[model samples]
Target: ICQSTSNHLWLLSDILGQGATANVFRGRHKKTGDLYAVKVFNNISFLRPVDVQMREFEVLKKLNHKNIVKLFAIEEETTTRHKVLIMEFCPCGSLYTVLEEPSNAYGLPESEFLIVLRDVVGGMNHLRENGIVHRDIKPGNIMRVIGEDGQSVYKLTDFGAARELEDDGTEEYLHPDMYERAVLRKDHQKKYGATVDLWSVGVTFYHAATGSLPFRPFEGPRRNKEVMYKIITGKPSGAISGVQKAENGPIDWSGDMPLSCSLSQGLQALLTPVLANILEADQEKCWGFDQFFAETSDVLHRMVIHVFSLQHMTAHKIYIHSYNTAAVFHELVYKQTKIVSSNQELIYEGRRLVLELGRLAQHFPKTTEENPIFVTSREQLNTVGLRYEKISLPKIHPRYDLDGDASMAKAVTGVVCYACRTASTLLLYQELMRKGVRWLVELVKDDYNETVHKKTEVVITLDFCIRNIEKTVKVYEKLMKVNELGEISDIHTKLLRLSSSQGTIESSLQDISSRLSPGGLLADTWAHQEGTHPRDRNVEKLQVLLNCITEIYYQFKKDKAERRLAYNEEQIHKFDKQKLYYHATKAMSHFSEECVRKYEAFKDKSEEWMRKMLHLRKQLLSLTNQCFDIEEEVSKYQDYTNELQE
Candidate 1:
């Protein structure tokens, strides 16, 4: 398959790992020489249907979040016809392997573990909000990669078990309610939702905190049932102790962590509540991401102590100053332990730039009835022209340098910088064209307004146009420099080819200049046309350009707010939270009804006792009256008998 060049641009290398349905391998894009993790689905007959694996493709396509693994492209092998998904390579690999592999020989620090947990929750929350349930949220599914801050950023992957929220999943790592539901199947009484992922997250955290599984299934006929029971009734401390006992005879703290210094009560306190709610037996009682995060407020506060100590050590070592020292120190807490390339920030910036272009385009009329040639030019810009080119930056290699040397780090940083510069320039150039178009369109639409500062606006916009053109040229030069650097020569070459194929900056700049030049046909035609103020036409151009500037500022403000809302919504799905609350309320109502019934029965018994007491009292009263009468009668008879005797 590698022999035939054909459409197989990616050259598959060593196998990264194997799974039930697919095999992941290190792959390089032949043309670009960019590294990626390629997942090739096996065409085995006994495995789940091909559609099951294909579902990941759909799930990944819809997601765009920092904490989720990015999907680059998907294709099929020509010879084998096997499906393939090209994904962002994560150097650190799975956290499960990190814990299990003897070579790693170390556990993550508490602070780092918390941060990793936070990123995973961020990813899961995104999926839940989008109505996708990641049924498998285990350690193996979470990939750790270096973030822009140089810290470990955990991204959730393996969406093979992901499905729409409505689909009833019977996968492991489920909340007890869902697990029971799955066990019962047709006999299942309760409904479950996407919150099941939270349970899996809790279990994962348990495993991370203590290097053992919380619910280890014993080999037996009722294995699943026994495991579920343990999970339902288990405490974190007991679970950890039990696993320690079962494995290494007994728990020990003499090695790296001394018996003199145990896990902090503060850390335990922070995780205890979160794990409680997350692992709650009742789905209704389970905590949403917000609730879980709220429980971490104390944890965050306590982290400040560790942060301050670390900051003191860092400052003593690295001489730097100015800025807000406290803020800078706090920021260091999230800084990467080692340097690595992360294109996450670049992708977001590009997305924002695209949205900005769309906003600028909106100022023009839907149809070009007012300006035929202008509308045609705009459509070309939107679809076939330079604006529609593939603008995505190439993927960064996972391992920048294993030895962690400054020279290697500097080289990788330089490569990332070049790619970012090229990507931003391309996007900025597109937005610049849209800005120019908006200026021309508005000038044509509002040619007669005296209030418009047309000349000044056009002058400023033209200046910007020239500046951007120069910047694009500089960007190309830098790309050439990077190519010469030899580290990323192929990537530089591929981008250069794409830039030229789409449309050169030279041509695009000339295209804009042709319409805006002092005596050009477009400028002459607009300027010579009959109007109320002929001198005002030039000023009118400036005024329209000024409007474009104003629009650009407001568009950012609007887009920022939209982005924030999207982020908050991603944190917690209100609908899902409401569903959980509804079920919880139902459970509470059942308990409330039972209490009311018990109260009524007790009240009835009390009334019956009161009636019986009253009846007994009445009989006693009658007997006392009869006794009095008999005594009086006897006294009279005695008196009568005494008289008769006299």
Candidate 2:
């Protein structure tokens, strides 16, 4: 058990609610009078382990996204009997509170649902972006963020169920030179990846949008077994809401269910091409490091075109813009970041690519006719010079390895055949974006029933930087093994020689190449240059990009660490800007409390002091009178009194 310190009394409202795991107090800032949600763990709850508390804190620390609740520091036993982690007080309450009926969740509008999806995705994205996956994501963990004026926003708050995907723990936790090593079987071990979190997201989305879970668990052998079988086999049996009971004492699926808003063929088509494709996906088809890295350029391309198109409201305008040109501009800004050394000449390439795509759009009549996902017109393709580089897939023994529907029976063979490991896999996928894969576009269309426009600008730019990294270093890489048996002096000499001499000539050649080809992804054509073997080229490129991703991850990790600490103390620190005004106001309340106490004590003593002073004054008057009387009597009796007085 952790020894807690005394908590200075903060304004405590009613016990807002209690859960089995913890009790929440609507605590106000003592100094600021601002409200906050404080979770207190009881002494008996010590069985839950301090690590869980620390883990939640750690998760909150690592995450900083718009949809995530901000965590202030822990108020370790302030006069309060339990430990509290002061978090952003959400007053509107939990999502569970607003859910009137479970099935009504799906009746939610697309626009409303989209924002929730975006935030969920945003939170998940940020976590995934940082290599952190939230294993459990449910509506219960979502809190409706309420402001002082009574407005609400949905933000994720619970991280008790989260774990860092990365193997390395932080400095606060250390590993020893000698420790017990234990291993569970690989299948039994938890697999940490973005997919698990994405699955949870899908589950939540189903609950929120359809007001029903895709699969509801049932108890007992008779009822639950069928439900389990249906879930395992992907047969959805019921809708969230059901109508009046049948006279037969059994509910039926046909007429009772509320119809969905968008049952359009185009939208349904997107389900197969995108949403479901990404979900329940085979690991081979699933995106990994390569796809993540290479897709940046594609995302960039789409962003620029979409942003520009939004400049005017044309749906097909994206096809008219030059993606290559957008790619060139990205490099220009990249040069400012000092992360990249040169810019690429993508404008001409982009122009050519867009125009070609525009022509194709014009010619493709069936594309728009069959799918509302696109504003189909082969004519729309006329002006856009869109082009694609055919991704040179590595030749495999069986081409079906990349196929999503490939048999699961040969999982081992598929893994063995995968030419790219984690690093190369990312490169392969990211590079595919340049080839015009519309996976994300398709996914959005399925859920939103929106038109699918190409995302070439942002995605492509991300890809370019990613590719450059692949060209220069590794994005998903482990460092070269430190030589243990070698002499220390020899190792030092080797390091010096490698760092100083290896790249001197290559750097010079790349410099000259950059002058000739202004605005190109690389300083030289070395990356694109033909390699001795395909495998060699793939390996080299993969390492470079992997290293780049790793480097950036470390940088963000450090920045977040500092922010987490500052944010934790944001409310408690008297001088912190966020809570300073509130604290000052609270101080006045304290001053008032002090003033009242002093006045009460003074009132009782005031009357007693007055009487004592009056009695002393009377005593002095009597003594003076006696002296005067004695003197007067002596004067009247002349010589006799004077003699007595003398």
Candidate 3:
């Protein structure tokens, strides 16, 4: 295209957007194809009364804050004498488009919402500071952009100093008097101040937080524009906000949060008290721009939470106190995520501010929003190698001052990384050892529950049988001692058989009881035998024996009680003591076995941790070969390292 004197002058390329006032185009001014969003105010301006000047055209050129979109030059069309305003372009799109996302139906996330909070406050503050009354403010007019360092920036477009644009936005953001000026009569025009703008700002914030307009009358075919304006004028603003359901039923002004409001209650409470002041219809009563900016700035600057991006789906938040060192930050992040602090690179503003283990406040304290410090490792193949064409940056970044000995600095960086990595390696190993100790303790308890619990009923039955045998044994002992058993009768022979069977059963009981002690096979330190309930097997063994033996013992006891013969308090006490000992001993044995196994398990893990830590030291040794005297540093650390190992 044959064009202007400067080859870098931008000319129209392709349509970028469609708007009510003007259609925008992506225009190129490329020494390479760098672009701008060109507003083509075509026949609308050309066909207007030529005598009336294009006045506000110069107004946009005056304001130049970073939060406001930068305006360049206005150019003329070749034949038709049409006007074109070329302005800064944002490829990332606008705040309205972001809220349109399905995920943000309830509003933006806390961090993203804060970006708008900061930008709009800053932009309006700057505009008001410059004594300009440029009015239009809304999410649609706010451009969302990504800065060079991958930080998000929200900038205001349409600095209404440029035209009717500075005057207003859509009807919802319209202050009531502005509504009358637009719809009724401009003959007695209300010369409202920036209060007209701040009212819109409050509405914008509400929509940003709740994802819907604060005031509503109707929608679709049931629309009435004047009724919507009436709702704004009538409410006593405490964000005295509400919705309209039927055609003319009622405008429910229940001053409360919408059912779908998704702001954190923390922010919601803080915002609610202040937004009410801005939305007031009476200008004298409104809080105005001063307190609005003050409230926003207070919350914005206090958020100094540093975010760490560990690839996709993982972002870690850590607050950096002024007293913190780069080493402290690295270790804090490492302790939580265990993502090797040594392998990390805490870069800020494209500078490697974290390579040296020094204080962050002294070295570099500021971190841009959402632009995370990139963490990477020297791969098996890719180390510090020179990039041919990009050699200047492929080697050095002067802001961090790495010019001394490039080769030596690289070696020292590695030495520092490897040394600290060795320390964390030792910590991880110690944790593993502690885990083993805990595991061993649990095994003891698990074994007891599985084995001792199963045989509880069986053991109780055995104790009862022994108590019955006790009665016979005690009485017979006395008879034999006095030589009083008349050596005769079939009854005496059968009594001797009873004594033989009692002795046999009692012996078997003692044998089984010993096995169920701490030395029991089922309760020993072994792989968790999930298929346990040795209780079932123990019960089966005692089943038939107890049935016949217990029945006979019961019959004997009943006969003795009927005559009230030989039974006394001493005999009952002795039987009770035997029962108590059996129960207590079984539990104690199981508990003791559990403790011993748990201790052994803990020791096993400790050994394994130590073995892994030793390998970690091997990597440390490799690093010492690169940077000399770093070996002495390792030796110095080793003086304290031995205690940690133990």
Candidate 4:
């Protein structure tokens, strides 16, 4: 008995999915034309206020993480008081659907499985840190979102079952201790801890890795209650009862009914510790965040290293070199883009790229004992350096050569143009990959770099710059699509170039943000420095200049669009029509002039900031080198002293 248009801006469409308490539907923002997922609560009684029913909406709105579904807005009709929550639209369905289908019999690949686990754990850890618990941690509550960078990211959803775990009673997915307490007391006053969610996580991951649950439910009517009891009492056979091995992690069961026998040894090993630790009957003995993350990260790090180490076939000598393809792609683009490579900007960028690539090399060897040569070869690559100098562009084809024969020139031009195009295409691929990696890495690094408000501010500033540029680019594209006077199309080439450059800038800034991550070289250096934090000052100035420039750009675009709309419209001399047009024209001119003036100022400020950053980087690098030399000298001195004593 409620109308859809009663201050509800989200136009709800067909139902995407249904849950126990709500139905999720595709929705469009009326003003922005942006798509979202709308979750509408169903059949709320007078006892539960709409606000109470929509408490999840408030919780979700406050929480922000890449692995958590973003809550956009909340709405309620005045008449019936029906509630709705607008959230980020995830194209891929829930992880439960992926498991329910028998076609995907093997389940997710080990790497992908680990990725999903990591994302979920990250989300859960975030909740724990904020003193909240997602009481339900089943696969159905985990959603997959294909990000703007084309990465398949798993996000935690369904905050309806989430709340602070100070003294929660129980749920079906509750920890064994909670169930035990509840069953024993038979009272609603029973309390539980946050580790209860970890138990549910273990179950969710168990099902994700294997096609079946760790323990099967009893077969009978009202069997769910029996299953819950069994969960509280049962000790897992595949994960715990098997003869424990001391080496090579854990063993997979064969001819299994409770678990998949065909599961990889690595996966089984990975799951054993998690399942045994988290699914423990005693909540005190259950795995916490650190233990779970460490074990999971170790297994995943080894797998990733092995995968990346497969491409070590160098032309000179076959050696195992660990490199992420995306990282390699970034180097390729950086090499081509460097003009007069000694430029301070290029030097700073090269330093960053070398360190990041070196970290990959270091990461692999730290986790794997199997190939010592990976460490050796990677060290050699480091010694050879990751620097590149600018090179001259190849000569133009004979077609453009005035002294060459016509036929010869034509053939040469064809060859040269083809080569140029191929190189350009490769560079384009490199650029896209760089942006994709940056976006993904930023998500990972930001997860850990909390507590320091300055770093957060820097990240927020850069994020704003990126979002503003992207939004501006979208506006330009939209204007082109809806071009009426053909005037907008004239800016098409400019828009394309601007979009490309902005993308490149955004990617580069994202890379820098990664380096500013907690425990990164730059962050560690800033920790040692006195006076104001270098990154803080640097980011603050850049943010100010960027904001100024972007604001002017936005105002200019708004003014331009207004002028274009008024260009062909018939002018009216009656009343204040002429005067209104005159005022608008003057305002537009003022904005344009202001934009030009600000652009010059922005350029100067940007240059100064860039040089300041480069100077700081040089000092940091110099001190780092001095530390290395001193360490080497100390080691040599120690060796000599030991020889004399012997």
Candidate 5:
């Protein structure tokens, strides 16, 4: 009785799903054995006009897009004569099934969530372009399939609850032009446009983002459908609505997203605004796909970071702009965290914000935003005198003499840090495949944390000089206090004693000079030596260590030779070669012997001071740098001494 006029016969083997009108089943071509998902109608009236009905459903066969499920053919069952729909099999199941898993209770991970949004937008854009609208645009209606290249491809499927139910499936594929003109609702007065699909897209997007319906009453959908409708209808678009998860509870509006989301604060800041715009019921306020596409791409493009405080050593999230300078960022953070520009010194990897952020990206990988530019809240240093601290010092102070444990330098391999690398690539996909969407988010956060650590390390390297100098200066500062507190009183008293004694000796010398040195030849001590001294064994030991300063040697030789010559002259004078008598001889004898003896003793003490001072100054030269000035230092000491004396 039946002639099977099927061009490519198919055998239905297993059931895939149950629907209001038809049950979906597995089917394969008898000869080719290619698999397909077949939709066969049971309840809807479809057989009234075989030719007209077949032509209507045939238009869908021309649907061609990676993001749209491919419908292969429309067929009729020979035994039952029910209309059948043929579709390419998708083994990965529906996006709804993926969401229902326990792991996704909160929401899909950020990476997967992005992929979903991207694909959905692409698919919807195609649908809108073709003037076709999908009323049931929920997650369940979207199908997922694995690709040959190891990617998860999602496509818009199942247009409505049971769309094109009366379609004659046993027909060839045809047109795409009349897809918009088909009226599914029979004689309904209301007109539906792209707005309906936009609303559904927004709902699905919110559900994917938050893991729950954004606007929902506590009661079941059918039990309180009117309540659900009013929640979406009668509200300011920005009033984000939620409900108490209780039996038949009323709707509650919130100003922002819930606190429990896993997204970073900066990321959440972007997503929240994006979500609220699209999720609006009013078309006037609802965000279009154009804006929606822009927002998600921006989200992906951003480098979120933590702004760390030096005052509390605490950190919080802030969005980053590479184009901004550190000075600009300083103010940005101040606005968010309420700190000061003067007090808060913003620092990046081993340096100040002397350069723009994006410009420094060449020095540092821009991707490493996970790091923090730990800013100090109240930098105690005024930085007025500390102009050099702003310059990134030579990584390793090159002078070996300058190598006083200020040990660090690196050659660059191109990251933004010029100091640490003188150092330190990746496929971002390895982040996804080797790990996953959850891993990607974790890594992104970890990257933020890691960036902060790196920046702190750069500061550590730069501050080696600053830190050590602080230690060095603090000691000298303490020493100043010690000196002020009479810690050097013994040396002070010794100098005072030497000064008073020298004053007496000078007065005695002048008295002697007035009496005996009138003719001046009598006062002559010794001839100045331009030649070397005679080799004396007794002077050999003193010769080796005593005269580091050549001037000290010359002065010592003058004092030594003069002391011997002057005493011998005094003895000769005592012999009275030109003696006037006993009385004259006696005065001369007393003046030469007593005064000369006393003068030699005074000269010995003065030379001792010279030798000791020479030793102290030489040691000071060794301990300090070449730039130190002994004369300048002594003048400072003199000023301090005078202040103390007063």
Candidate 6:
């Protein structure tokens, strides 16, 4: 492919910094000499932070802020190459140098500190007012410059913490603590938000004031189990907020944090509070960006107006005020609940953002709609050169209840039916998970159902017959034990063995042949019924028994192959196709019987959701018609009004 690129207007000399994401280089306009920051994020970063990687394209496209970095343009030189983000570069580099670098750190000679406070607060306040929070507001992230007059100005960098990105901009994952916990923790996007930036800011403030990081959890004793416990629990607490008092008496130990500047007390008080929150034991309760910036602004205002002094400011002005943060961090260990059951509902809400992002990305409709082969859609798969074994239902519907009363089993039937319906829906969803099947699923229900059903009596819901097959599987399996052994037993245990045999024996052999075995009651039903003769009845019954045995043989073959690790995708697909077709055919047979009975069985159990899908589609279509009528009326009214009649 011819790789895309825009004309480069400049080249940069100074290499600024490198991060887990991209490398920062300082560039200057070739013709105008305007300095710029060029960021080159690794293409391999695409493999991880999928949301962030995608969002980079979108965040660059949509982001518009005065104080935020301005993207002059983007240049994609190649399809599989790094994208160049051309942004206005701040000359003084990261706030880390300004706050912590021994030789070049930005410290208050009283007046200079005020300038730093004002610029940083100005930019931070602007971001907050705009409903945006720079989640990683660390000293390194605060790119800055020193004016000719020796005053410092700050600019916010990185939109990484911007809210759940719209598809493309959604990949920000790491929080400061998580990063500290595991530097190479590739799964940074696990849990994160704009509040994360506030944590970074807290650390930045601590570095600015004390000239040392309070919690470099990634290193030293802070990483130790015992020390981490003390910090989180607030046990044997270390010095926080207050200046280290000399042994004798209070001296001129205030050092660089000075008074009498134009800087407000609100701003000055921020130093201690920011440090406390940043260095707090519990990061969960630490000051977020909103609280941090808001309080710092207030402190600066008060200090300038002399509403508070240095001593008082230290107590009241600082905002990272959660002692509980210390307590939480001081706890020794953490425990997490384990998901122990396969049937446990993994609530999608936990991963809601991921799905929402998928929905957003889906807006860029796929060019190809080719769907995957579903075991439920074996007929379709078979047409495409896929092999499938056939399933056979046993012929005889045994009289498990001597009285022929299905009422005692009413409760079990209801529960089994409900489970069946749910499994069917879930099966469809699983098909949707495969790359291409969703489009076909969309046609399962339509708006004109009521009119169409009245005319032709065709039901859309019946076409996706997996639910019925599943329910029949459960019910027949349960009833089989009662019929075969001539006794009642634990329903669940019996159900379990039935399903196990069905899956392992019948399904397994059918898997190799790529066909469903003619087995179960349905198979029995398919056999010829001998009328009024004892010998004929025995022969017919024997045939049904043979069918069930054959089904078991297929099931066992499949299970053995799987156990021996001999089954491949081809074999699995073959067997699954067979299973779906046979079961579906059985469902159709039952459905035929239901139609003859006016579908009383369907009405009693499944009509709720089956009707629901159709009803929703109808309502949507009806709304569309109403909207059309309203538009037509408006057009007519406009024509009449224009006539100026009478």
Better-scoring candidate (lDDT), 3 or 5: 3
Per-candidate Cα lDDT values, in order, are 0.44, 0.38, 0.52, 0.46, 0.49, 0.39
TM-score of 1: 0.38
lDDT pick, better of 1 and 5: 5
Candidate 3 lDDT over residue span 442-548, tens digit each: 43344334434433433343344445445554677677755323432233344344445435534544444454456554232332321123332322322332233
User: What would the per-residue lDDT of candidate 6 be over residues 1-646, giving only the tens digit for each residue?
Assistant: 1222344333334567676556667665556667777776645444444466455656554555544566676655344456667777777676676543212222333444555566666766776565555556667677776656776666667764343322223236656665455544434443344455555555565555444544322234334445434443442122342222333232122222322121223344445545455444444556555666676665455322111111100111112222223122111001011112221111121110111211222231122112211112111111111011122332322232212212212222222222233233222222222211122123322223333342222112222232444464469678784432223233334434433433343333333222111342112111122112223232233334334333433443454445433447446534543443354344434423322122222222222322333344344455445434433433332221222559
Per-residue lDDT tens digits of candidate 1, residues 254-313? 112221111333455446556666765555466665666555543543322221111011
Q: Top lDDT: which candidate number? A: 3
Local accuracy of candidate 2 as per-residue lDDT tens digits, 1-646? 1222343233334666566556667766667667777777554444356787777677667675678887776656654455676777777776665543312323344335545655666666566666555667888777777545654567876664332233342444555421222232233235545565655665565556555544444432245555444443452222222222322232333212233322122222222222332335345554443343243223222221211111011122122123345334333223222123121111111121122312322232222211212111111112111111211222223222212111221221222212123223223322322221132222222322211111122223334433443443342233543322333344344333433332442354334334334354312222233112234354444334334323333333343445533543433221322222233233333323432233223322322322332343243334334333433432332221112443
- By descending TM-score, how would the candidates be arranged? 5, 3, 4, 1, 2, 6
**Residue-wise C-alpha lDDT for candidate 5, range 65-131, written one tens digit per residue:** 7888888777777767777777878877888877764245455766677678878878887776775
10 residues in a row with least lDDT, candidate 6: 306-315
- TM-score, model 3 to reference: 0.43
lDDT of 6: 0.39
Clashes of each: 9, 89, 7, 0, 18, 71
Give residue 324's lDDT in candidate 5 (0 to 100). 40
Candidate 5 TM-score, true structure as reference: 0.48
- TM-score comparison, 5 vs 6, better candidate: 5
lDDT of 4 by residue, 30-93 (tens): 6667778877776442355666646655665668888888887777645656667778888788
Please give the range of 10 consecutive residues that has the lowest summed lDDT in model 4: 308-317
Give the runs in model 6 whose Cα sits over 4 Å from its true position: 1-5, 9-14, 31-33, 45-67, 78-81, 100-108, 125-133, 146-150, 161-194, 216-292, 303-646
